[PDB]
Amino acid sequence: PVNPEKLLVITVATAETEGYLRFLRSAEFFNYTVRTLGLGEEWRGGDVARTVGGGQKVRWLKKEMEKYADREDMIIMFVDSYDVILAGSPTELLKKFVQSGSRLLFSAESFCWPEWGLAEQYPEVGTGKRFLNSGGFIGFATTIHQIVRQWKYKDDDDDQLFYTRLYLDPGLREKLSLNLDHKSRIFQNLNGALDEVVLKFDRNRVRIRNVAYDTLPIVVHGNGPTKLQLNYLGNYVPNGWTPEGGCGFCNQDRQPPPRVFLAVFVEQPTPFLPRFLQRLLLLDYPPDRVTLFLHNNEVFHEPHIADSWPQLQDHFSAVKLVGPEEALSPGEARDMAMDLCRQDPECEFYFSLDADAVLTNLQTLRILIEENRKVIAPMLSRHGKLWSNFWGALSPDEYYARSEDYVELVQRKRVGVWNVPYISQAYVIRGDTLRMELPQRDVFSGSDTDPDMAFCKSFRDKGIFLHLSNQHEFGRLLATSRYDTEHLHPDLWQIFDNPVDWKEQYIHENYSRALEGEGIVEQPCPDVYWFPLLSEQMCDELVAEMEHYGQWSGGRHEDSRLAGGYENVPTVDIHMKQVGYEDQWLQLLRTYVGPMTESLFPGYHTKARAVMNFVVRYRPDEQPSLRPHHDSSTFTLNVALNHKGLDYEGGGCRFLRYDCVISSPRKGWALLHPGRLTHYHEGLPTTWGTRYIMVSFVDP
Amino acid sequence: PVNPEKLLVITVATAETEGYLRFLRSAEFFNYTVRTLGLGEEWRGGDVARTVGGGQKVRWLKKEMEKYADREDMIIMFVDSYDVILAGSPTELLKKFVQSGSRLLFSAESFCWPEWGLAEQYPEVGTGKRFLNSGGFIGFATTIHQIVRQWKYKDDDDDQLFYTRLYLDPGLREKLSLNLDHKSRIFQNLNGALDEVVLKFDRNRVRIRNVAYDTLPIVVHGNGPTKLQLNYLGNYVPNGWTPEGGCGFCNQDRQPPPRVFLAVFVEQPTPFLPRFLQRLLLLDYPPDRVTLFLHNNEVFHEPHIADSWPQLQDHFSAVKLVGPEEALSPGEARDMAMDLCRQDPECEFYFSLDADAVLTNLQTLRILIEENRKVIAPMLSRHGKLWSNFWGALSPDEYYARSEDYVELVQRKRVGVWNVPYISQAYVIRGDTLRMELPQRDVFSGSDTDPDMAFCKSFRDKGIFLHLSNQHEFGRLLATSRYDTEHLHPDLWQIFDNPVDWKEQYIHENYSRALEGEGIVEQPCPDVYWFPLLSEQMCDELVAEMEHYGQWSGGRHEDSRLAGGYENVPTVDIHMKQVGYEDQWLQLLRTYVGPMTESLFPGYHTKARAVMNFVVRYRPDEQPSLRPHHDSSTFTLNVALNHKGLDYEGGGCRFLRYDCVISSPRKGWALLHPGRLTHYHEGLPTTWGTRYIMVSFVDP
């Protein structure tokens, strides 16, 4: 029964990197005792990410080990720290070390590195890993001292070669009782073994299991090109996120606030941009503490920017527009905004936000800052879809890939603050990180690589984690791919691609309340129901689009109305077919008019078929009235599109058999009445101005 | 200027026949002075209708003329009387006689009769008639005496030959100044000249014009086979019927009544026979004075006769049924009934009435008797058609023909009492005529000729006029030709052939009042109208016909109802298609339901299309209810066919959105409600008995 107080973990760290700090938390979770070598020093160990090196680790260990050269009572484990997490206790570790019968147990690995020719000198192992890895080892302090004291090489000579040569000395191997952890009982090196490692869950703890060997490793080493797979595992192992605990290092449940540089990017035609700009004024962060930079690459959006710039300029403490005439690429524009923050010591946080990011959570900026990370993005998804502003995994050549937990995250079955290889569209970056760790100008530019990926790789290459919070609902992602801007009002056509935003803009704000009851729907005449349907903006834009087309009806035009046996009852009008809006209006019918009708006429069921959908214009100088008639419809929908009094004078609809008149219609409100038999009706004369009406003959 | 007081008309008449009396009225109209020879005597003049004869006329004239043998101051005209009418005044006659320059002017005619060989001895006339006719002549009494005194022949030698021989004596012709009225200036003989004679009308008088010669004859002689054309002209000339006077010899404007023998004849299957028998009880003639004979040749009608015979027997003073088992032909049956009257001196009038005669005028029998004719028929027509119970003219071989005034009579543009060659279906014949003038038994039988024609020819052969009154509305003629008796209730199928009777029997007695307003139509629930439609007899017979078929619906049966999205909402029922009544019911829809709907829903128009027309049966032991649903119809018609309380217990129809229930439906009344959208409805459970309902989904 070895005493855990006789175990000492020694690692090397020249800076307190996120990886190093991640290592310590996993150590502190299990009450390990950790000595860190090298914390102030310059790394002279070479480019371990690109080649051989790391001898400086040994040189430092050798010096440290002179204290313990005679301490047979002490067990020491050496591990890297940037790319290591601990998954089990000192008790289970010492139990396993004893069971190995070794005096110094090195980790094992699939590759004979860095001299592939030496493989033949290694003992033949069966199904186990055959070669030594210096990223982790454990043994008596005396034995370890007898190995490392032999170090006499350059700081950038390779440490693993050095240990390999001593391991392959057969007399030394036998005399000192050196061994390798062939079956990853203690040490799990990820390189060459990704398909052997899976997460093993418990109530308040997560581990890894090697499925090749059915073991539960103590130490997870993301050596070589497996740092990002280790990032993934470190989100869980050992207490990153547990089924019963939730995340462990998150802010969980939520006086001058830091000064923020808010940069808005508009790099494609984007729907609902006026709405986005108006939202900037509502973000719950003191505007004297925010300075706004907006890059617009779209001539399409210049009027939209101009309309709201007076308000933005009055709102924030400083504003700057970079417009299409500067001919900046998105890469150059994002480098510029970020560098404007970098070069201002007063810029404490940098907040990048693309025009397709809809932030429903007004406290987003505060929430992200309070998480206190170098880089953190709020999770944003396409409504009801799996597409989102991050990636959970990378392909072998650093392209897109789907992590095994991606759906769990997007669906918020697992919520927390995740270490992911790619984020986009919104993120908050610490000013000091820009100054001290990513000082270059070419963050997004410099290669043919697309900027959004260049950005993420810049941070990954420095070992800066890219964090992603799905801890709260933050907002959504607008669809922008096939946005048709060849309309007077393109957002009218957005009904299929952005239905949630389309409804917020164009459906009446009180529709849903009226659909749910609450005494809003009225019945002005027998079986004629009256409810709010269209917002004023929808009315205005639809009329506008109609006049912009301009081809109103005239003589010899025929509608589906029935009067006086067989006569011709026409209106001056434009059908949806003509302006290319029929599919759109039919969707509004299926989605919003169908369910209201079924609720007002219990027992009736509808798919909201309608062949005749047209806007009617009334004027005293062309066609001011519409004589008594019936409609070819089961029911008729009649929506007012402008204001009685303001835009026209004169009455509206009259139902003759009920001697009931709808005078004073309401803009955006719709009448619902039967089309046949009972509700013979006429449109009263418009006496001044112009009357606009939207009508569909449903279920003909 | 010859003095009319010096003119004397002499004719011959052995009996005061209708023709003779007709002659006198035309004479009295113009104030002629007429001496009649032969009134008491037996006619020994032969068969003038069949051969030569008439010498007795001359013998009597010769005797008469000895008084006037020297009276040069006197002008005498001889004419027949049975077949003669006068059309002009003695003044115009004497004026024309003088203008002829003759001393004795004989009528002229187309045929050299009765010795065709004598034609060559006659003077050549141009376009005029070339030969003598003894039916009319006029001359000085001295000259006429010198001609007739030569008569010394047999009573049945031919008189016209006798005058012809004296005319063809050229010396006598010259010496006595004998002439013929070649151009019908005074005398118009009809035989051989029918196409020369037309009626010429004046305000209060009618004449004839010869169009060959452009003359206005004084004397119209229907000689030979032209008695019936003369009958026709005598209806008008001279004061029979005038444009401003109407008829002249009619009863125009209307204490034991004569005893009548009423004979009813049923010689084919006849629709609405129960109704006809019931009508017999309503004829406004004291039933103690009527004795009823009914011949039925139809086993089809035996139950109908049996049902009402108790009532008939109690009503009239004596009744007699002759039924199918006696195997009488209609001819033998009509001979029998008529002979029962003939042989009863107490039978003062005989009234024959066929089963297809609908007498709407209850005072018919009185009206006909008060006209005081030997034989008289009320005018009866097919509703709205030209077909009627008389003929105005005969073909050359005594078959059917259409008189030139036939349409004027049927349409009652000319009303009066007409002398026509054929009557049928109803007529009143004087008992004394049967006894004294038509004593034979074989009136209708005896030849292959059909009885209806044999009857008329029997009377015509005796010179008895067949009179026809269109002076009042008397009734109508049922159509019987293609009556289908292969139904439990054949009169249900009579909708197309006898619509007026069908409506009186099967349409509700208060329908038309309700169609016209008058607060009968109710609106028990919003836009559900309630009106009387079917009589109780129609309800009973339709249900009966339905059960007689018996093939009610069951499982897997599908109707055009809409509920709960897509589900199966069926009834236990029989569609009209199945019992062969759909065309019928569709007509009832077009004729009675269409117009009511258009009046209750102003602005709506209908041809009353309906694919689904079915009777529903409700019972607690099969299908007692009908769950909430909509109908595939613009509007639905729902007619109750039996009595709540008497035939069933339990509620009826409920309209869910109006929380309005039609409990207690009315037998024969119909609901009218929209089929779609607003009027979701269910049929409440029938809890005792059986519920029958008639339903059509109109305008699907």
Ligand SMILES: O=C(O)[C@H]1O[C@H](OP(=O)(O)OP(=O)(O)OC[C@H]2O[C@@H](n3ccc(=O)[nH]c3=O)[C@H](O)[C@@H]2O)[C@H](O)[C@@H](O)[C@@H]1O
């Ligand atoms: O020198 C080593 O220890 C190993 O480095 C690489 O493999 P790798 O595990 O990916 O190296 P890292 O884990 O990225 O860095 C090695 C350790 O050196 C320390 N280090 C490294 C770099 C640095 O700037 N500061 C610093 O403290 C960290 O503990 C770091 O984990 C080489 O491929 C191995 O052959 C070599 O044995």
Ligand SMILES: O=C(O)[C@H]1O[C@H](OP(=O)(O)OP(=O)(O)OC[C@H]2O[C@@H](n3ccc(=O)[nH]c3=O)[C@H](O)[C@@H]2O)[C@H](O)[C@@H](O)[C@@H]1O
């Ligand atoms: O004897 C005649 O006077 C003529 O009778 C027929 O021609 P029609 O004019 O048709 O004879 P009717 O008019 O039917 O009868 C002749 C007249 O005799 C009188 N008459 C005849 C029959 C009779 O039973 N009682 C009677 O009084 C009537 O005035 C009767 O009109 C013959 O065809 C002629 O040749 C003949 O000249």
Ligand SMILES: *[C@@H]1O[C@H](CO)[C@@H](O[C@@H]2O[C@H](CO)[C@@H](O)[C@H](O)[C@H]2NC(C)=O)[C@H](O)[C@H]1NC(C)=O
């Ligand atoms: C949506 O419904 C709200 C609640 O009834 C409406 O609100 C009122 O607006 C009137 C004038 O516009 C004010 O005088 C009231 O004080 C408001 N009431 C509340 C509770 O805020 C609102 O007008 C409706 N929206 C539209 C577009 O009609």
Ligand SMILES: *[C@@H]1O[C@H](CO)[C@@H](O[C@@H]2O[C@H](CO)[C@@H](O)[C@H](O)[C@H]2NC(C)=O)[C@H](O)[C@H]1NC(C)=O
């Ligand atoms: C047709 O309408 C008449 C008039 O309203 C109905 O007549 C009444 O019938 C009730 C009972 O049947 C009597 O008590 C009233 O005295 C009647 N009124 C008159 C004015 O006669 C008649 O019932 C209706 N016919 C049907 C078949 O419903």
Ligand SMILES: *[C@@H]1O[C@H](CO)[C@@H](O)[C@H](O)[C@H]1NC(C)=O
């Ligand atoms: C770590 O040590 C503390 C005593 O300072 C003890 O209370 C705690 O339970 C230990 N945690 C574990 C996981 O052993």
Ligand SMILES: *[C@@H]1O[C@H](CO)[C@@H](O)[C@H](O)[C@H]1NC(C)=O
């Ligand atoms: C017939 O004679 C009477 C006199 O008795 C005379 O009043 C009447 O006008 C005459 N009618 C005609 C038509 O001459």
Ligand SMILES: O=C(O)CCC(=O)C(=O)O
């Ligand atoms: O002017 C109105 O409100 C009635 C017009 C109407 O209902 C129609 O389009 O047929």
Ligand SMILES: O=C(O)CCC(=O)C(=O)O
């Ligand atoms: O039982 C009733 O009165 C309602 C039945 C009905 O309307 C139907 O035939 O669909």
Ligand SMILES: [Fe+2]
């Ligand atoms: Fe139109």
Ligand SMILES: [Fe+2]
């Ligand atoms: Fe309309």
Ligand SMILES: [Fe+2]
């Ligand atoms: Fe059915």
Ligand SMILES: [Fe+2]
């Ligand atoms: Fe129904």
Ligand SMILES: [Mn+2]
């Ligand atoms: Mn490492």
Ligand SMILES: [Mn+2]
């Ligand atoms: Mn004659």
